[PDB]
Amino acid sequence: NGLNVATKNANDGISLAQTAEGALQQSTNILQRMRDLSLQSANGSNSDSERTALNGEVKQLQKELDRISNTTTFGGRKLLDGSFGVASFQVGSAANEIISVGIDEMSAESLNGTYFKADGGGAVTAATASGTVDIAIDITGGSAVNVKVDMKGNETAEQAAAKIAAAVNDANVGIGAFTDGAQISYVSKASADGTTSAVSGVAITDTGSTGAGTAAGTTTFTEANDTVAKIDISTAKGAQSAVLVIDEAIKQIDAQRADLGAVQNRFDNTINNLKNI
């Protein structure tokens, strides 16, 4: 007795899981479109105006993520807004024989990523003499990556800062350097275990006594976390941070989808067993 009902319940569990998987497939594609807008905006040929327009599109996509999380439903229950929790499906003839389907919030606010930030200790100064600036980029768990810039000896502080920041970016070792006038700030990806910055320090030596000085270095990268709702690609720094947050958000949806896939197989097994009974 109860086998017909247990089988229907199981099949509803499958349908709910499929309903969630179809919604989350939409969300992943929206994040991919956001990630492409962010890579486009990071490009240094863009004016501020063009980055403002690309951010307008990202804002549309953020609203699409929130459509999906707020309207995705199975029967009378919302699946993705955080209110779902875990549904217990009664898939046996005895009381309290359950397969659970857990679905977490999947919205612009819940989706997030951790990265690391730092600011130079002070402004780059004018390079009044020609010669080399050495920058040592401290790789967490490896040695230093050493890069160089040649000052002509005529750079303003701002022009000297653009050159130092570009030497750092040209190394492509996981760190972005961004100017605001003569000041430099830094974004690094997380290390392999997610616990610290992939880059732990930036140390400048003004080897050639150019006058640029060494203040734009920093010993300290601190943990940062943004939700997908806080992403803003109207600056190159925001564009590059957004790519980092989006990779994490894609991983989070992927984990939820893999769980929903695996639960579908448990329901399949149970249905087969019930049939055999």
Contacts of 247 (CB under 8 A, 6+ apart): 35, 113
Give the residue before each break in the chain, using a C-to-N cut-off of over 2.5 angstroms; say none if it is continuous.
none
Burial class, 203, CB count within 10 angstroms (exposed 0-12 / middle 13-18 / buried 19+) = middle
* Residue environment code for 145-177, b if the CB has 16+ CB neighbours within 10 A, otherwise e: bebebebeeebebbbbbbbbbebbbebebbbbb
Q: What angle (nearest 5°) sits at the alpha carbon of residue 164, between those of residues 230 and 191?
A: 50
- Examine the domain organization and report whether 157 and 269 are in the same domain: no
- Dihedral of alpha carbons 119, 122, 125, 127, sign: negative
For the chain, what's the residue count? 277
Q: In Å, what resolution does this model reach?
A: 2.1
Q: Which domain holds residue 234?
A: 1-105+228-277
Retrieve residue 91's tokens.
């898939």
Per DSSP bridges, beta strands 131-139 and 144-151 are: antiparallel
- Examine the domain organization and report whether 127 and 216 are in the same domain: yes
CATH code for position 144: 2.60.40.4390
CA atoms within 13 Å, Cβ hemisphere of 66? 11
* Residue environment code for 29-68, b if the CB has 16+ CB neighbours within 10 A, otherwise e: ebbeebbebbeebbeeebeeeebeebbeebeebbebbbeb
Number of Cβ within a 10 Å radius of residue 28: 15
In a 3-state reduction of DSSP, which class is residue 161? helix
Residue 31 to residue 28: CA distance in whole angstroms: 5
Cα distance between the two ends of the chain: 10
- Examine the domain organization and report whether 251 and 160 are in the same domain: no
